[PDB]
Amino acid sequence: LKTSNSIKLVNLLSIFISTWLTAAGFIHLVENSGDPWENFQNNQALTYWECVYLLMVTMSTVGYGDVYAKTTLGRLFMVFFILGGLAMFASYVPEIIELIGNRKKYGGSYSAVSGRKHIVVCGHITLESVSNFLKDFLHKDRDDVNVEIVFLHNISPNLELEALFKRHFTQVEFYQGSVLNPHDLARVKIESADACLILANKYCADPDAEDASNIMRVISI
Amino acid sequence: LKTSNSIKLVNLLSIFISTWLTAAGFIHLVENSGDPWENFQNNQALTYWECVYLLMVTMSTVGYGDVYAKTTLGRLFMVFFILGGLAMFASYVPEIIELIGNRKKYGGSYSAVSGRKHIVVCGHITLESVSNFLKDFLHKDRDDVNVEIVFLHNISPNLELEALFKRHFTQVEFYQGSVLNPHDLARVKIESADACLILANKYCADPDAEDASNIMRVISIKNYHPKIRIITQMLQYHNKAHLLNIPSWNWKEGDDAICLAELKLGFIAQSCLAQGLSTMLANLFSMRSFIKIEEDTWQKYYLEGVSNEMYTEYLSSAFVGLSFPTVCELCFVKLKLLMIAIEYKSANRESRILINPGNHLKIQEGTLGFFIASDAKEVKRAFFYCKACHDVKKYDSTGMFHWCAPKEIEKVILTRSEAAMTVLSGHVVVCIFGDVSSALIGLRNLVMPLRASNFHYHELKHIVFVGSIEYLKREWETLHNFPKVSILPGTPLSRADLRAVNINLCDMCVILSANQNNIDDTSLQDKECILASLNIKSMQFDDSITTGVNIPIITELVNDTNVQFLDQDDDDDPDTELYLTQPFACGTAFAVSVLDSLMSATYFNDNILTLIRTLVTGGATPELEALIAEENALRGGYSTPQTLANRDRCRVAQLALLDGPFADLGDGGCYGDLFCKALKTYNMLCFGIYRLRDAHLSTPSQCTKRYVITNPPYEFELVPTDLIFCL
Amino acid sequence: FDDSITTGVNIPIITELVNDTNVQFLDQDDDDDPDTELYLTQPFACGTAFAVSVLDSLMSATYFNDNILTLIRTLVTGGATPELEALIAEENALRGGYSTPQTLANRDRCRVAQLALLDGPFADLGDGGCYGDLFCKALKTYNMLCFGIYRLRDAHLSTPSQCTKRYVITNPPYEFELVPTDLIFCL
């Protein structure tokens, strides 16, 4: 089918409408029925797609007198959807935020432009590790070879680091993922890159293992 | 009443209704009392059930204009009820926590279906310790016995692990609770289960405080039902002797505990004798997915040898009186089954297991036949074979090993110059990491199969522990009774150490790490072994590279994704699982996680974990394992001529088809001629070929990587580059 | 063990326990009921497990009598007087002395021991009689305050086995039958 933002959204949507559409499915049986102290005279001769347009409005806590709820069942059909959402709304919040939080936001491949030859700056990317690097690489006094920087790290950046990324909007791409995972090396196009610059954490605790960790990132490439 | 899932419903429905009815009485009296700017009159009598709709519309925050009820006092209590509703949701928003979290069965009981039986897999339940077990127990090539799996743990399951449980929904259950409660053993119903398995936390901090914890779970179960079969993973060897102390523990009934430092360091110790036995054996107890590759050549010959498994079946009455080499010929020529070992009934309480005996034995009625086959159907045809229609001196006191006088540590601490003096051709180098904070790998289990008394004293491989002395002095009180053991201090990352050991003239460079099994990551904890492997595979040597890359090494791995980094010829994305990769198929990378499929293979056939113990540890009779458990390391005897019959059971080695009386068959002859003539003349079992990767004509190179094929047919044309796994 | 199970389970062992609920693991021939609290278990009443939580009830007994802890500190710790505790207030160790006849006079207090009802002065009372008569014979003749019995678990006497797990009975009545295998707590 469609992308992974849509595939995971299938079972999240198919369960939601099924409880929703059934709730007005009891309105339609009672809208022909009416009050229990009557001769089974209908509440309204309207159809089912009328109430679809009305119960969805009352479910989002709106008045106006949408559904004519005269029946004692219709008096209690408004009780139905409240726990129908409350026993479900604790399961929608950490995913819709993840839906917009990863709308292939920092995922996605690299558009291998024929003009843009590119480098892959991986390793310990922080604010101070890159602010010294973008000054003396992306400098306007160079005879500017069409060389693009494609960062690659397993940690989503700070917005202050994105503030440096946003000002260099045309010469920086940041991606998620580490170079220890060979799916991410294809995503970042090592096969048509020029150089893969591995920055290092200068202020670690055990520098005999930190640069030994960099050799693992060397071997994986 | 019931528990707090029902008590808190009683706690709230008394709170809500007592105001829900009190609100219903407000409006009806307000419809009788009046309203001061409504001319002080109100004579309505809308009764109690109608007032809910007049007030929950004001409570659902909808406020419809369909309702005409616009009076002053009804606006006033709805101010008081919305301010009153906040006290209710101050308690009820906490009460949604015990509603969505207690909609699970995790705390309920198991419904014992009479039509089948179940097992209980408790202990240590994570993703990788369970996902590696469910694949090889709930396998589609299994004869689908309805044997359900009832997990039991005092930790709420990972939602990705629950996603694995949703895959296997028809068999797998989970239940909250420990195994140290006789009520939690009553919900899971181990009074009618068939087995109760114990997993282990292999990557723990203290392997003694974790392994003693697994014996408390053993004591707790056997109190509750002292007939149940249990299967336990251990982490050390020295403290699986505590399981003998439990009086219900009868290993003759199925209670077999799986040591992991005995089998890991035993499969590596057999690969120092014939390289590939760490993956020759580790394919013989896993239900491997028999996919068929067609175009390739080193993977097509391999995957026909990955679907072969050890099966047991009783010998028929026709074999009685026949010698062992006549039987294996009659099984391989006629039945097309390889038969590796028998179960000789010396006593019903003392029945030894015998791999490949000579002409000394004859088949008794009631000896069990250990076969190797691809199908459970074909192994039954041995029970239906008939001739009618189917046709001073220092060894151990036990005498299984070698033994010497106890030596001090400083007697064998070699320098770099001393190791350059002695010449060490064809030996075993062991690389050891760890300071003092690293837990003790059980290095007695590495040395003991290399000191089995099948070997003459001139044919013992010399063993050099290139490690650190503040680690290796901790190990040394278990090792100091063996011959020909040396220790060179200094890191195995250093080349000047490894040139002193003459690692070019080696037979196996075992790389072991004893460090913390969580240093930083799940992907950065093998950096000490990959850099020690890649160090040796780039060295230069004199001609007087000699092999350079072709030094045969073997490497344990904490993870399994790190198998990519050992060779530079891989084509491996990080979901090509561990048996298909080249460093595992060639026999140079033994991860521990291929022994997680052993306890699924032990449950279905009891004589599967005992067939590998004796093949792999060499000796390891329970009469000898008790004596090591008594006081100390081994003790010496004075070589009586019945303990010298404990020698020469079976040597395990490989040999070449380049010379000897087999090269006339080893150039173009069929493999089925080679197997029959070895038993007929020299009485050794040819159970596998160690095939070079480029024996197929593929632009002839210097790639000396040899892969392992298990039990090739009577067909299958040889190549003179081959090596044969013999006994 | 060999003279050259065979005296392997008859080794007397006492074990302190941190958790009370682990007490059923100490025996394999016990009823494994979980709700049976710590004094109703078998390895406690035999006297082979001493949990720490059994002293939590000593807070309650000390509020209602000052004189409980005044006694069971004397009975247990050799009779440590506050005159000695003032010497340990100076806190090195016990300080030595040269045994004056007042120093040596602090010996005639009561030792604690068990007595076997075999091959001695009490073989007459061993086969039958009552405990309340053994109490009078010990106290008059020997000044041994008999204090409680330590009876084998097979008191029904069908002689089925050789288990020696003896349980303890505090203050049995005057008319209480004895068997010749009991051990009596005395002073």
**Residues 6+ positions from C33 with CB-CB distance below 8 Å:** B182
**Residue type, position A75, single letter:** R
Place of tokens 């090596």: B723
H helix or E strand, kind and range, residue B692: strand B688-692
Please report residues of B whose CB lies closer than 8 A to that of C24: 223
Question: What is the CA C124 to chain-centroid distance, rounded?
Answer: 24
Residue list, annotated binding site of C = 24, 27, 30, 32
Please report residues of B whose CB lies closer than 8 A to that of A214: none
Nearest CA in chain A to B60: A61
**Contact check, Cβ <8 Å, B182/C25:** no
Q: Which of B521, B555, B498, B536 is nearest to A209 (CA)?
A: B521
This structure's resolution (Å) is 3.5
User: What 8-state DSSP symbol labels residue B333?
Assistant: I
Tell me the C-alpha to C-alpha distance, in Å, between residue B583 and each of B535, B571, B704.
16, 12, 13
Which value, in Å, is the radius of gyration of the alpha carbons in chain B?
34
Could you say which architecture CATH assigns to the domain A4-101? Orthogonal Bundle (1.10)
Q: In the 3-class helix/strand/coil scheme, how is B257-288 assigned residue by residue?
A: EEECCCCHHHHHHHHCCCCCHHHHCCCCCCCC
CA angle at residue B288 from B287 to B293, to 5 degrees? Answer: 155
* Rounded Cα–Cα distance for residues B464 and A82 (Å): 74
Identify the contact set of chain A against chain B, taking CB-CB distances under 8 A: 58, 61-66, 68-69, 72, 75-76, 78-79, 82, 86-87, 90-91, 180-183, 209, 212-213, 215-216, 219-220
* Rounded Cα–Cα distance for residues B175 and B156 (Å): 9
Identify the contact set of chain B against chain C, taking CB-CB distances under 8 A: 181-183, 216, 219-220, 223-224, 226, 246-248
- How many beta carbons lie within 10 A of that of residue B524, not counting itself? 17
Q: Are B234 and B240 in contact (CB under 8 A)?
A: yes
Chains A/B: 3 or more C-beta pairs closer than 8 A?
A: yes
* Rounded Cα–Cα distance for residues C70 and C68 (Å): 5
* Rounded Cα–Cα distance for residues C69 and C67 (Å): 6
List the determination method: cryo-EM
Q: Are B276 and B706 in contact (CB under 8 A)?
A: yes
Beta strands in B127-200 (DSSP E): 147-152, 172-173, 195-198
* Rounded Cα–Cα distance for residues A92 and A132 (Å): 42
* Rounded Cα–Cα distance for residues C153 and C148 (Å): 15
List, in sequence order, the alpha helices (H) in B311-423: 324-330, 416-421
Q: In the 3-class helix/strand/coil scheme, how is A22-87 assigned residue by residue?
A: HHHHCHHHHCCCCCCCCCCCCCCCCCHHHHHHHHHHHHCCCCCCCCCCCCHHHHHHCCHHHHHHHC
Parallel, antiparallel or unpaired: strands A196-199 and B117-122: unpaired
* Rounded Cα–Cα distance for residues B356 and B353 (Å): 10
- List own/partner pairs for B166-172 with CB under 8 A and 24 or more apart: B168/B134, B168/B138, B171/B138, B171/B147, B172/B134, B172/B138, B172/B148
Maximum pairwise Cα distance, chain B = 125
Residue list, annotated binding site of C for Ca(2+) = 24, 27, 30, 32
**Residues 6+ positions from A100 with CB-CB distance below 8 Å:** none
Distance from first CA to last CA of chain B, Å, rounded?
69
Question: Does A160 appear as a known binding residue?
Answer: no
Maximum pairwise Cα distance, chain C = 59
Neighbour subunits, C (≥3 Cβ pairs < 8 A)? B
* Rounded Cα–Cα distance for residues C145 and A49 (Å): 97
Roughly what angle, to the nearest 10 degrees, separates helices A4-25 and A48-59? 110
